[PDB]
Design a protein around this ligand. Structure first.
Ligand SMILES: *[C@@H]1O[C@H](CO)[C@@H](O[C@@H]2O[C@H](CO)[C@@H](O)[C@H](O)[C@H]2NC(C)=O)[C@H](O)[C@H]1NC(C)=O
Ligand SMILES: *[C@@H]1O[C@H](CO)[C@@H](O[C@@H]2O[C@H](CO)[C@@H](O)[C@H](O)[C@H]2NC(C)=O)[C@H](O)[C@H]1NC(C)=O
Ligand SMILES: *[C@@H]1O[C@H](CO)[C@@H](O[C@@H]2O[C@H](CO)[C@@H](O)[C@H](O)[C@H]2NC(C)=O)[C@H](O)[C@H]1NC(C)=O
Lengths: 462, 124, 124, 124, 51, 52
């Protein structure tokens, strides 16, 4: 006999396509109030009843830099974060000429903060009054190039009308799961030896991803997942000097810092009904904002990164430098801490060399030896190009403290010339996507193709 | 076996395990209008596939065989090198080029079985 | 014949070509929320018509004949007066006044077949 | 009897009167996007129930009997104290604890029939 | 009395404040039960029931 | 309307005080407008005063 065509429904056949994925949040974050933060506001409560399911003889090729999930996550973040600023104050009367004197806080001079006073159009609008506030010198621009140097302006109002973030939403990085919609699934690669592109054998399917922490950072990666075996080096073309080469760590580093300056919040009424928060007096002595990393762990980490770098560069050593001058959001480790924005000079982190022969990293001189980064603080944030491009961060009282784990690095190879035996590196930053691409690297989405055709000895009977 | 645990298993193993995959094709939630759009798209996709099973007289999860003979140019395969070894993914990687042939041939199979039943339900 | 190429053809000519017309009943796109409303309205209309076909035991594209006798007051036409000459549009222009009794009479046809089949599936 | 007028009638009386209740399961209109969400949820619920009837080989309003023997731990009831007196509401208030078992058993007796019929359409 | 609490608005003088009788309807898949007992004292059973 | 001496019959040269982006350093500016877009300000006699 011959064979005859037969259809089957419920067939495990995958296709690759773009799709829209919704967000899920941890259920305990639904204890919080409505219109508080992104979890209760927009996402769906999760329930881990459909757990991970391993697959058998499957074989799938992943691609990290062609992943559409991060390129959709960026727009999801940009739209939700633009929506979260609408009910707040739009400033506008604060664009006045500022008169700033010497920074006589408790005598002396505080070198970062200027004492300025300005005329406030009050809520009655015909009883405008004098007010005073302390501002950061990154937020203060001289008004004219003439020698009238006691007349100043905010850095905004010549480019955009800025806004203050509402001080009852929070900037806590809530872990956000991405899930598959109806008729879709998420493949996850369990091979820890995965080097950015290519096949994966240990493959599972999940209904929702690992909790992604959307931390915006430059030159270092904050709280995030750790590598499973060793330090992983990922680059789309490692030979390409313009490509950001991401380093994922196995052993975490612990960073802890603060603003050791006992600030005080001041309230000003700007127009009818709505208020504005600024920095008033400073109580206590003036201290420098700084961040700390233990020295022996940092030297151990950079020597291990050099060890992994020697798996692609044969006999050369590994050298580092600081960033190439740049500007504030590019050349400095820029990270959020409790609501404040820190910019730390990273040069002290990378004044070192790995000679290709690793030295015993204990070699005990002092376990309490630390490397220290001076850090500056901005309030007016030029956060993203195209977001509602300005935001004012209100100050928060008391000394803040924060503590986290360094798990990832961003690097750019300085240009290979003269056949040098180092091919030195610089820290990198810029497009935030490669932060999230450091976390969404295990995942792909599959279009389910359920209908299949096979030849069978079956024949329909009349 | 859930939504996709059938992958990798052979033809005989995946002749079973259909409904636990095919039953999870409907869901939806809220993040915005775009998720409603994707939800309606998923519903319309499932409804279109159920319709395409609807023309050919299958109308179920059962092993719906028609009577059209298998041309050799679609597989060029022995029965042993289809059922004993193959799985559905690299079977689809061969057969998927003939959709405008097969998905019209089953509509021709429901051509060849309808009026010659209507006459045997009326002229008999 | 596509979505509407069968119009104008006779009753016996359009006894076929149902499927290529009825297969194009599901789609949608974006200009706003109104288009999504019209899209789910179209999905609702198709699902309602599939439900009305599912009540009468038809459940397919097939030429589903029930056993209720035709009444002369609905057509007053000869068999030749219906089949060889008419097309479906001016047939509808006559028959469309009796929908509220025909769409009840086929549910009455599903009255007269079900519990008898259940007893012949249980009491036998 | 309309959408819910059959409630309170016994087992025998409500063995009939099904479609005039079950036919009113699809509607929708405008007050906002929340009504679109509720409308798509209603369509999803109705489609899921039609699917769940779809696996078990029922695929209609018919009194679809499968072949699992009834276990006494689900009702502990005589035929007279089910059919002659009881109505569906406080029947559900007894049987509803076993629904995740019963809805698995009917798939289990679809996992007893069509491969045998496939062999009786191929190996015969 | 405002402007220290909120900057508020004038109602448009072409909408009106008439209490239009508004009916509530259940969508597809649900139903509305109404208790026709006038002796109903806030909680508990009802027998004269319509839909 | 002295464009290059003489009069352009359609375009009026007008100057107005602009509240600048600093809002407390308002400055004079000038622009040319079309006479369909320009209305005399009041019926009371002050003829060199105009409005959009
Ligand atoms: C910032 O400047 C303001 C001036 O607007 C200072 O306030 C005045 O300080 C002088 C000096 O002690 C007092 O005589 C006045 O009574 C103060 N005026 C008011 C309204 O308080 C203020 O002390 C300065 N603050 C800092 C931290 O430098
Ligand atoms: C503000 O600074 C004080 C003193 O620097 C902090 O208090 C100390 O915090 C350290 C944290 O390691 C503890 O070990 C000490 O026991 C604390 N007390 C003292 C008297 O030193 C305080 O934590 C800081 N504020 C915040 C909010 O962290
Ligand atoms: C429109 O009017 C302005 C006046 O505001 C003219 O500008 C002045 O023209 C005079 C005459 O040549 C010069 O002395 C000034 O230096 C000009 N001032 C400025 C700021 O440029 C302007 O020429 C007129 N333009 C037209 C097209 O009529």
């Amino acid at each position: 006999e011959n064979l005859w065509v037969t259809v089957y429904y419920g067939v495990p056949v995958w296709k690759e396509a773009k799709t829209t994925l919704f967000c899920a949040s941890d259920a305990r974050a639904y204890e919080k109030e409505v219109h508080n933060v992104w979890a209760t506001h927009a996402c769906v409560p999760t329930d881990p009843s459909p757990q991970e399911l391993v697959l058998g003889n499957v074989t799938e090729n992943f691609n990290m830099w062609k992943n559409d999930m991060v390129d959709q996550m960026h727009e999801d973040i940009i739209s939700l974060w633009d929506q979260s600023l609408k009910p707040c104050v739009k400033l506008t009367p604060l664009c006045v000429t500022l008169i700033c004197s010497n920074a006589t806080v408790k005598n002396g001079t505080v070198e970062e903060m200027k004492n300025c006073s300005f005329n406030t159009t009050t809520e009655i609008r015909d009883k405008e009054k004098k007010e005073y506030a302390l501002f950061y010198k990154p937020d203060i621009v001289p008004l004219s190039e003439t020698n009238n140097t006691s007349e100043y302006r905010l850095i905004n109002c010549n480019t955009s009308a800025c806004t203050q973030a509402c001080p009852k939403v929070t900037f806590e990085p809530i872990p956000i799961h991405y899930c598959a919609p109806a008729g879709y699934a998420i493949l996850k690669c369990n091979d820890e030896t995965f080097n950015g592109t290519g096949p994966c054998s240990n493959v599972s399917t999940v209904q929702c991803t690992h909790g992604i922490r959307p931390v915006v950072s430059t030159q270092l990666l904050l709280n995030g997942s750790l590598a499973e075996k060793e330090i992983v080096i990922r680059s789309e073309n490692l030979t390409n000097n313009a490509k950001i080469i991401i380093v994922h760590l196995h052993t975490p580093v612990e960073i802890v810092c603060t603003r050791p300056n006992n600030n005080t919040r001041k309230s000003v009424r700007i127009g009818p009904g709505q208020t504005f928060y600024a920095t008033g007096d400073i109580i206590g002595d003036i201290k420098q904002a700084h961040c700390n990393i233990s020295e022996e762990k940092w030297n151990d980490t950079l020597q291990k990164v050099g060890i992994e770098l020697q798996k692609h560069f044969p006999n050369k050593t590994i050298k580092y430098n600081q960033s190439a001058g740049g500007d504030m959001e590019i050349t400095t480790h820029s990270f959020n801490c409790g609501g404040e924005f820190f910019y730390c000079n990273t040069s002290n982190l990378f004044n070192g060399t790995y000679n290709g022969t690793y030295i015993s990293t204990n070699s005990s001189a002092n376990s309490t030896s630390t490397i220290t980064l001076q850090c500056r603080i901005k309030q007016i944030i030029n956060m993203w190009q195209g977001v509602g491009r300005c935001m004012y961060a209100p100050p928060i009282a008391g000394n803040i403290t924060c503590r986290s784990n360094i798990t990832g690095l961003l690097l750019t190879r300085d240009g290979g010339t003269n056949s040098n035996e180092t091919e030195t590196f610089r820290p990198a930053g810029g497009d935030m996507r490669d932060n999230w691409r450091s976390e969404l690297y295990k995942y792909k989405v599959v279009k389910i193709e359920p209908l299949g055709v096979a030849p069978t000895r079956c024949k329909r009977r009349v | 076996l859930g939504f996709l645990g059938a992958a990798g298993s052979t033809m005989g193993a995946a002749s079973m395990t259909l409904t636990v995959q095919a039953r999870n094709l409907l869901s939806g939630t809220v993040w915005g209008i775009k998720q409603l759009q994707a939800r309606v798209l998923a519903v319309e996709r499932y409804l279109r596939d159920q319709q395409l099973l609807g023309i050919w007289g299958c109308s179920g999860k059962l092993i719906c065989c028609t009577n059209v003979p298998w041309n050799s140019s679609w597989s060029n395969r022995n029965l042993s090198e289809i059922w004993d070894n193959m799985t559905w993914l690299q079977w689809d990687k061969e057969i998927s080029n003939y959709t405008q042939i097969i998905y019209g041939l089953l509509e021709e199979s429901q051509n060849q079985q309808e009026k010659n039943e209507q006459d045997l339900l009326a002229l008999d």
